[PDB]
Amino acid sequence: LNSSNYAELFNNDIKLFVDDTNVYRVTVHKTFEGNVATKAINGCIFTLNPKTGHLFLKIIHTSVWAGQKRLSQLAKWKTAEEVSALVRSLPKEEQPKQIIVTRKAMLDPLEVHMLDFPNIAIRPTELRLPFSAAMSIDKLSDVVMKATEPQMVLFNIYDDWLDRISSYTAFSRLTLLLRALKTNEESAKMILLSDPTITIKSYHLWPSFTDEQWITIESQMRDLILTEYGRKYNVNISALTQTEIKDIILG
Amino acid sequence: LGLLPKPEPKVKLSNMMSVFENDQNITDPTAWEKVVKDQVDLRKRKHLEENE
Amino acid sequence: SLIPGNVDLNKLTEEREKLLQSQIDENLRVNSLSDATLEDLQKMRTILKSYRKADPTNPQGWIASARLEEKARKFSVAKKIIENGCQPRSSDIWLENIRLHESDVHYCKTLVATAI
Amino acid sequence: KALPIPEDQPKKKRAGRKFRKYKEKFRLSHVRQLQNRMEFGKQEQTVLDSYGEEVGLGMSNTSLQQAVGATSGSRRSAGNQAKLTKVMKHRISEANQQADEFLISLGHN
RNA sequence: AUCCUUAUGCACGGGAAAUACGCAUAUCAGUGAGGAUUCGUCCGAGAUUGUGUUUUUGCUGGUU
Ligand SMILES: *OP(=O)(O)OP(=O)(O)OC[C@H]1O[C@@H](N2CN(C)c3c2[nH]c(N(C)C)nc3=O)[C@H](O)[C@@H]1O
Q1: What is the CA radius of gyration of chain B?
Q2: Among all residues of chain C, which has the CA nearest to that of A119?
Q3: Chain B residues lying within 8 Å of A211, measured CB to CB
Q4: Residue D10 CA to E48 C1' — how many Å?
Q5: Which residues have a Cβ under 8 Å from the Cβ of C4 and sit 6 or more positions away?
Q6: DSSP character for D103?
Q7: Which of these, D55, D45, A118, D48, lies nearest to C31 by C-alpha position?
């Protein structure tokens, strides 16, 4: 996947994204003896397809890692196993074709479980996909942090944007949200929540709006990424071309 | 000869994604929804107008 | 469609004849292919070994190393692995082991005494 | 009638949605390019042709698909697919249509 | 006044094809072109001939 390959995501080909960066996590602590301590919490693999805005989250339980050493490699194979499970649950109507993964570390271990489905193709990306930051979503993280077992939970990431809007822009906004939740995290959260009159229902993730609320919000969300990237790398925002910005946004 | 405007591309909700004409494609996602969706209706409105 | 690898007739007739029947109702591996090179097979083995090492438990990766190996080669190799990873709880390993390994009745019986 | 000239003419480009769809016939697709890759220091997968001459299909399978000899569906490009000429296209349909009439006769008779 | 049918013209929207589309101070051609046949008869408009372009016609945009 490139900046020149981006459009080919949205053809009628059924697709999946699988990104494992959030599978095994660590919490810094400070021991009572007394130095730094390290505890793992739940591992979730985020697998989602842009056309229908559907998630499949496998919530990796902490006890999954309890008795095993070299937990670096084990997680990848676990993820692969989960992915193999995922497709065999979908009938050949719903089975994908291009499964796509960001980490190149996942290409080999998938293929070993993906032999039974020779039709399915696997890609790596030169595009860093901000589904690592998807744990900044509260409702998800809540369900995840409260989860007592390895499980499966469907969601609709696009809320009801699809009713009102084609899935391409529906997914393009979702970048700006997630690209901006890698960046200045909660300080970016406040861009959404300025109005308490704007309510997140029990169903949804992103709060409901009008169209022109998003039109302005997207401008704000767009700004951070331009300021932080320049600021970190000491580059003025004003210089960049239309093209240039787009690449920054994508990663 | 330059008596007439150079034509800009037609755009649709199909063609929408892969037109990288310099105007706010990925940058403003919902601002580019409106332009095309507005654009589509303006063409149609013309069909209706020629009729009436 | 023309790369020569794919065609199996039995899929082909079953896939078709059915279609023909439907139409009527509405109206109303390859033997050519060279066997696995030793170098390439070696690649597979390493990956499966890595998987096995990654989990000493989870026999799901154990039967795969038996089954994937079995299709490619089988015989001496797989039958030794299915015995090795057998080492009690999983039923699946036991089920796998008897079928490949057994040929002979005494041995089958002995294998059965394992799961039981 | 006279050969045009051998002088070259600057290359012109276009490509839309429409012109990509036509050209797709005349380019070696992705899957078909991987047959031109020959992976060095090891023997090609070959399958013998009807004729029996072996057809090397080079990297077209992944090294884990060789060892299990799965073969790969991969991604099949529908665009090249062969399709009938204009002349020929109606001669089939016309033959078919006329044939249906024939069958009915025997149906009623 | 509504409604309905066929032809032709401009036109939004959806498809398919470019081994296809034409052109001729040029030969014939329902005063029968070119085919089918169960052998009793049945369909009825183009066929020759020379030629132009045909993995492309015009037009923009990116990146070097
Ligand atoms: O639409 P408009 O009233 O302008 O029509 P005109 O003013 O041009 O005038 C006379 C013609 O009216 C049509 N009408 C009108 N009505 C009510 C009517 C007509 N014709 C019929 N038939 C002939 C069946 N029935 C009616 O009830 C006629 O064309 C008159 O010429």
Answers
A1: 13
A2: C6
A3: 30, 34
A4: 40
A5: C30, C32, D47, D49, D55, D57
A6: H
A7: D48
Identify the residue whose tokens are 């994604």: B17
Q: Report the C-alpha gap between D18 and D65 in whole angstroms.
A: 36
Q: How far is C107 from chain D (nearest CA, A)?
A: 28
Residue C1 DSSP SS3: coil
Contacts of A189 (CB under 8 A, 6+ apart): A136, A181
Burial state string for D76-100 with b = 16 or more CB within 10 A and e = fewer than 16: eeeebeeeeeeeeeeeeeeeeeeee
- Which DSSP category does B15 fall into? G
Please report, rounded to whole angstroms, the spatial distance between the CA atom of protein residue D92 and the C1' atom of nucleotide E26: 35
Q: How was this structure determined?
A: cryo-EM
Distances (CA, A) of D15 to A128, B7, D12, D51: 28, 17, 10, 40
In terms of residues, how long is chain D? 109
Interface contact flag, A74 C55, Cβ < 8 Å: yes
Output the CA A95–ligand 1 centroid distance in Å.
63
CA A250 to chain CA centroid, Å, is 13
Resolution, expressed in angstroms to one decimal: 3.8
Phi first, then psi: give them for residue A69, nearest 5 degrees: -95, 170
The CA-CA-CA angle for residues A21, A25, A27, to 5°, reads 145
Helix (H, G, I), strand (E, B) or coil at C3: coil
D108 touches strand E (CB under 7 A): no
Contact D43 C34 (CB under 8 A): yes
Taking an 8 Å cut-off on Cβ atoms, the answer to whether D47 and C34 are in contact is yes
Contacting residues for A112 by C-beta, under 8 A, at least 6 apart: A80, C47, C48, C51, C64, C68, D64
CA-to-C1' span, A122 to E63 (A): 28
Residue matched to tokens 């193709």: A121
Angstroms from A171 CA to nearest CA on chain D: 22
